[PDB]
Structure formats: structure tokens, C-alpha cells
Amino acid sequence: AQNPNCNIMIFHPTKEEFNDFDKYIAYMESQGAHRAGLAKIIPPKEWKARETYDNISEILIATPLQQVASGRAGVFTQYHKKKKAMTVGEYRHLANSKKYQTPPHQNFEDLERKYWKNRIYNSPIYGADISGSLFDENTKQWNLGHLGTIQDLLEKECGVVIEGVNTPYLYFGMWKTTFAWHTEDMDLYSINYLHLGEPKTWYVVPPEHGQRLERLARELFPGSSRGCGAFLRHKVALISPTVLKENGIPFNRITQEAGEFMVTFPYGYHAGFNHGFNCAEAINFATPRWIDYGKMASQCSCGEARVTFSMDAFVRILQPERYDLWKRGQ
Ligand SMILES: O=C(NO)c1cc(-c2nn[nH]n2)ccn1
Ligand code: NI
Ligand SMILES: [Zn+2]
């Protein structure tokens, strides 16, 4: 078995290897990459996502979110308080202000220490799930706006016909901006490109051990768990590496820098934080290997996880027994 210890693997495709997205995903899996739940892809040096990021300040963040924590430093939930709209230009200036700027630090280890020590005592702002793309239309390889859709994969594998069209989204982050422990909707893959700015640190649990994380989360957030078995789909819960180690949860960590892709694999739980102002782009995608994860994916039916109407047909086709209950929660 390839990659038995479930280490996060890093790939350096050549230009020729970068010309067929699904073929290269399959190659990474032939090397065991998916056993970690996350992989890093460094594009060939000749490739470029966009020629220049001039005028990115003109993008609108219609509903910036302030991430307010409750709990202890290593075990906390966050809720989002909505803020007034601001442009990326205004957001970047706020990120670099004295209140929000990255602190002096010796190296990544030091910064990660300061994050887990101090995150709960600040409430950073960020811009999430903004439909859009920053790839140049003439970037032809690994352009997240020109991938095959999840609907076309499902139609091809199952011979069904469904509505829906999935598109990429943008994220704007600052120091301490946080993504909570989750897997993707329907346990799909995701791909994330860091366009611009400071790094993003990721934590991941191997798919073969995701239920261990679920059981710990239920123990650590009892009230949250009671309302909904699938409450990690609410994207609210954080658990530090120190607490994971203390409870024997297997995980790994890696830092993504600008110009690098990260892929998450089906049922790979992930979480992380931003080092400073940055801009990323992400989309979900599917392969033939995903179909059996989609059929088994847990669902939130309590109401809290709102998800846009692409997901209806996925529940309807793959999980018809669960559909009426899921639909009631919507
Ligand atoms: O919401 C997510 N996946 O469904 C998600 C969000 C992030 C994130 N990156 N920068 N800010 N947020 C990363 C991984 N996953
Ligand atoms: Ni994610
Ligand atoms: Zn729920």
C-alpha cells in the first residue's frame, strides 16, 4: 500500500504533466496521496495564473464576517457576525492596520504558537465564498473556472440528468482568519489556489480516521453535538494540535504559500488559518472514485448548514432515502 503513514505529499508536475487535470489527480492517488486527506501541488515554473493583480482592490466584499470565538484557547467555536460591505482595497488596509497586522515572529513555528495561544482573544474579519475568479481567461491549465463540473461527472458516472452549475469562489483573509474543522459538502474534493499575499497553514486528518475526529468533537462540544449529529458541517468548531495529540487523533500540518495549489480529498477533515492579508480561490470537484463517498456522506438536517441549490440533486440522486428529511431541514 502506498503512503501507509498517511503523510501529506508534495508534487512538482512538469508542463506536460500539467495539461490534464483528472489524469494528474489519478496519478497522485496511484502514489497514495489521498490517504493523507490533503496534497500540495507546485505548478511548473513556466505557468502563471494571472499576469498582474493590479486593481484587485475594486472587488466588493458584500458581507465581511467577523469571527467571534467562545471557549478556551485550544477548544472553541466561532460564530460569524456580519459587517457592512467593504471593498478589497478597504479590507487590505484594515488587515495591515495596527489592530489586525501580523505580529513580529521568528519563523512559522513561532507564529503557529502565537495563533493557538491568542486567537480566541481577537476577532478577525474576512471575506468568504465570494463567487468569482482571478484566473486569466487565457490560462489554459488548472484554471479553476474551466474545470469539468460536478454535475457532468455525476451525469457521466450514473447516467442521470440534473440541474445545477458549480463555479469558483474567492476568499480574502487576514492574520488569525480561521477555517473550522470540516469535510466538503457530500464529501467532495476541493482545490484551493493561493493567488496573493501571506501564507495559509493547514491541518488535516486522514480519511480512514475521520470518525475519530467526529467522536472527539462530540465529546468536546456537547451542546453543539446534541442539536445535530453532523454538526461539524456547521463549520464552527476548532480543536488545536495540542488537544488532538492529547486525544490520540492522527493529523498532519503543512503551510501553503502564494502560487501553490492544495487539494483536499473525499472525507478529509481540514482546518487552518491565515498568516496575514491574502487572497485565495477554491472550487469543489469530483472524480469516479468520489461517487461511493457521495452515497455514504453524512447530512446536516437541523437547518444550520445552509448550502446552495447545487446540492439538492446530489442528495436526490445518491441518497433518495435521506432526501425528504434533508429537504425539511432546508
Ligand atoms: O469552506 C471551506 N471549504 O468548504 C474552506 C475554506 C478555507 C479557507 N481558506 N481560506 N479561507 N477559508 C479553506 C479550506 N476550506
Ligand atoms: Ni474546505
Ligand atoms: Zn446541523
Q: Give the DSSP letter string of 84-134.
A: --EEHHHHHHHHTSTTTSPPP-SSHHHHHHHHHHHGGG---EEEEEEE---
Helix (H) or strand (E) holding 169: strand 169-173
6 annotated as ligand-binding: no
Q: Strands 189-197 and 261-264, how do they pair?
A: antiparallel
Helix (H) / strand (E) element for 10: namely strand 9-11
Q: Is 90 exposed, middle or buried (0-12, 13-18, 19+ CB in 10 A)?
A: middle
- How far lies 197's CA from each of 101, 120, 257, 270, 278, in Å? 13, 23, 8, 21, 4
Q: Which three cell numbers stand for residue 128?
A: 468568504
Contacts with 109 (C-beta within 8 Å, 6 or more apart), sequence order:
none
Is residue 206 within 8 A of residue 37, CB to CB? The reply is yes
Name the residue with the closest Cα to ligand 1, atom 3.
184
Residue nearest to atom 5 of ligand 1 (CA): 179
The identity of residue 281, as a single letter, is: E
Whether 280 lines ligand 1, by a CB cut-off of 6 Å, is yes
CB 266 within 8 A of CB 293: yes
Tell me the chain's radius of gyration from C-alpha atoms: 19
Superfamily of domain 1-330: Cupin (2.60.120.650)
Q: CB-side exposure of 161: number of CA atoms within 13 Å? A: 0
Q: Is the CB of 173 under 6 A from ligand 1?
A: yes
The annotation status of 12 as a binding-site residue, yes or no, is: no
Compute the distance between CA of residue 88 and CA of residue 64 in angstroms, rounded to an integer: 10
Residue of 192, 194, 307, 310 to test ligand 1 pocket, by largest number of atoms within 8 Å of CB: 192
Give the separation between CA 69 and CA 76, rounded to whole angstroms.
Answer: 6
184 lines ligand 1 (CB under 6 A): yes
Residue whose C-alpha cell reads 446552495 in the numeric block: 308
User: Which position has the grid cell 451525469?
Assistant: 155
CA of 305 to the centre of ligand 3 (A): 6
Find all residues with CB under 8 Å of 232, minimum gap 6, and list them: 180, 181, 182, 183, 213, 214, 217, 269
Give SS3 for 71: strand
Backbone angles phi, psi at 282, to 5 degrees: -145, 155
What method was applied to determine this entry?
X-ray
Is residue 77 classed as helix, strand or coil in its secondary structure?
Answer: strand
**SS3 state at 28:** helix
Place of cell 482595497: 89
CB distance 315 to 204 below 8 Å: no
Q: Is 179 touching ligand 1 by the criterion CB < 6 Å?
A: yes
Distance CA 150, CA 144 (A): 13
Contacts of 25 (CB under 8 A, 6+ apart): 189, 263, 287
**Residues before each break in the chain (C–N > 2.5 Å)?**
none
- Whether residue 200 is annotated as binding a ligand: the answer is yes
Q: Which residues lie below 8 Å from residue 60, measured CB to CB, with a gap of 6+?
A: 85, 86, 87, 88
Helix (H, G, I), strand (E, B) or coil at 55: coil
Cα separation, 278 vs 172, whole angstroms: 6
Distance CA 132, CA 36 (A): 29
Q: Would you state the torsion angle of the CA atoms of residues 163, 167, 173, 178, taken in this order, to the nearest 10 degrees? A: 40
Q: How far is the CA of 194 from the centre of ligand 2 (A)?
A: 14
First CA to last CA distance, the chain: 41
Facing residues of 61 across strands? 86
How far does the centroid of ligand 1 lie from the alpha carbon of residue 169, in Å?
10
Kind plus residue range of the DSSP H or E element containing 254: strand 252-256
Residues 6+ apart with CB under 8 A from 67: 78, 79, 80, 123, 124, 125, 126, 176, 177, 178
Class of residue 4 by CB neighbours under 10 A (exposed 0-12, middle 13-18, buried 19+) = exposed
Contact 260, 41 (CB under 8 A): yes
Gap from CA of 329 to ligand 3 centroid (Å) = 8
- Resolution of this model in Å is 1.6
DSSP letter (8 states) at residue 149:
P
In angstroms, rounded to a whole number, what is the distance separating the alpha carbons of residues 192 and 283? 7
Task: Compute, in angstroms, the gap from residue 299 CA to the centroid of ligand 3.
Answer: 8
Question: Is the C-beta atom of 273 inside 6 A of ligand 1?
Answer: no
Alpha-carbon torsion, ordered 306, 71, 123, 210, to 10 deg: -50
- Contact between 184 and 311 under an 8 Å Cβ cutoff? The reply is no
Helix axis angle, 311-318 to 320-329, nearest 10°:
150
Which position has the grid cell 468548531? 237
**Residue 300 is assigned to a ligand binding site:** yes
* Residue 168, amino acid: P
Cβ neighbours of residue 223 closer than 8 Å, sequence gap 6 or more: none
Q: Which residues fall within 8 angstroms of residue 270, CB to CB, at 6 or more apart? A: 37, 38, 179, 181, 182, 183, 202, 203, 204, 205, 264
Helix and strand totals (H; E) in the chain: 10, 16
H helices of the chain, where? Answer: 21-30, 88-95, 108-118, 150-158, 210-220, 222-227, 241-246, 291-296, 311-318, 320-329
CA of 177, closest atom in ligand 1: 11
The reply, when asked if residue 126 is annotated as ligand binding, is yes
